[PDB]
C-alpha cells in the first residue's frame, strides 16, 4: 500500500544461487552499491556492507545456509537471494524463511544483478519496504 519511513537495514546477507561465472563478485558489489544509493535517496537506507555474501547451488543448500545465518548474525534483518531464472530454490527460500525460521527474504533475478536499471532497483526497494515496514 503506502511507503514506510524509518526503515534502516543494518544487518543483511546475500545468498547468490546464480553461478559465480555468470554473476561475479563485481556484479554483486556493483548491484549492492546501486541498491545502497537508491535506498538511501528513498529514505530506507540499506548499509553498503552485507554481513555475509556467498555462492550456493540447489534447493538442498537453502535450509542449511539459512540455519547458519540465523545462528551466526545477531540482528539479521534480511537475506537478499539471487536466482538464475525460474528455479525450485525460490519456493524453498520461502518455505524456510516464511514458514520455518521466521526470516525476511527478498528474491531478485540474476539479470537485474548483472545489469541494474533505476526501475528494477526501485521495484526491489518497494518489495523490501513492504516486507520490513
Ligand atoms: N519460481 C521462481 N523462480 C525464480 N524466481 C522467481 C520465482 N518466482 C518468483 Br515470484 N521469482 C522471483 O522472485 C521475485 C520476488 O521475490 P520476493 O517474493 O522475495 O519478493 C520476483 O521478482 C521474481 O523475479
For 100, half-sphere exposure in the C-beta direction (CA atoms, 13 angstrom radius) is 14
Q: What is the rounded CA–CA span in Å between residue 121 and residue 38?
A: 7
Give, in order, the Cα–Cα distances in Å from 114 to each of 83, 111, 122. 12, 5, 16
Ligand 1 pocket test target in 89, 90, 110, 128 with most atoms within 8 Å of CB: 90
2 falls within a domain: no
**27-42 burial, b if ≥16 CB within 10 A, otherwise e?**
bbeebbebbbebbeeb
| Residue list, ligand 1 pocket, CB within 6 Å | 83, 86-87, 90, 105-107, 109, 127
Query: Ligand 1: which residue has its CA nearest to atom 9?
Result: 90
Evaluate whether 97 touches 62 at the Cβ level (below 8 Å). no
86 falls within a domain: yes
34 falls within a domain: yes
How many Cβ atoms sit within 10 Å of the Cβ of residue 23?
20
CA 85 to centroid of ligand 1, rounded, Å = 9
Q: What is the rounded CA–CA span in Å between residue 115 and residue 90?
A: 21
Three-state DSSP class for residue 99: helix
Query: Ligand 1: which residue has its CA nearest to atom 3?
Result: 86
1 falls within a domain: no
Cell numbers placing 9: 537495514
CA 108 to centroid of ligand 1, rounded, Å = 6
3 falls within a domain: no
Q: What does the DSSP assignment read for 57-92?
A: -SGGGHHHHHHHHHHH-TT--EEEEEESSS-THHHH
Q: Domain total for the chain?
A: 1
Its domain, for residue 26, covers 8-133
Tell which residue, 129, 99, 124, has the closest CA to residue 111: 124
Amino acid at each position: 500500500k503506502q511507503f514506510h519511513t524509518g526503515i534502516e537495514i543494518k544487518v543483511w546477507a546475500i545468498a547468490c544461487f546464480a553461478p559465480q561465472r555468470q554473476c561475479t563478485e563485481v556484479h554483486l558489489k556493483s548491484f549492492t552499491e546501486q541498491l545502497r544509493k537508491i535506498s538511501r535517496d528513498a529514505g530506507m537506507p540499506i548499509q553498503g556492507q552485507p554481513c555475509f555474501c556467498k555462492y550456493a547451488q540447489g534447493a538442498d543448500s537453502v535450509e542449511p545456509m539459512f540455519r547458519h545465518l540465523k545462528n551466526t548474525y545477531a540482528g539479521l534483518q534480511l537475506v537478499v537471494v539471487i536466482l538464475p531464472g525460474k528455479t525450485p530454490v525460490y519456493a524453498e527460500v520461502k518455505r524456510v524463511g516464511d514458514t520455518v525460521l521466521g526470516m525476511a527474504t527478498q528474491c531478485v533475478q540474476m539479470k537485474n544483478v548483472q545489469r541494474t536499471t533505476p526501475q528494477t532497483l526501485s521495484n526491489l526497494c518497494l518489495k523490501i519496504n513492504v516486507k520490513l515496514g
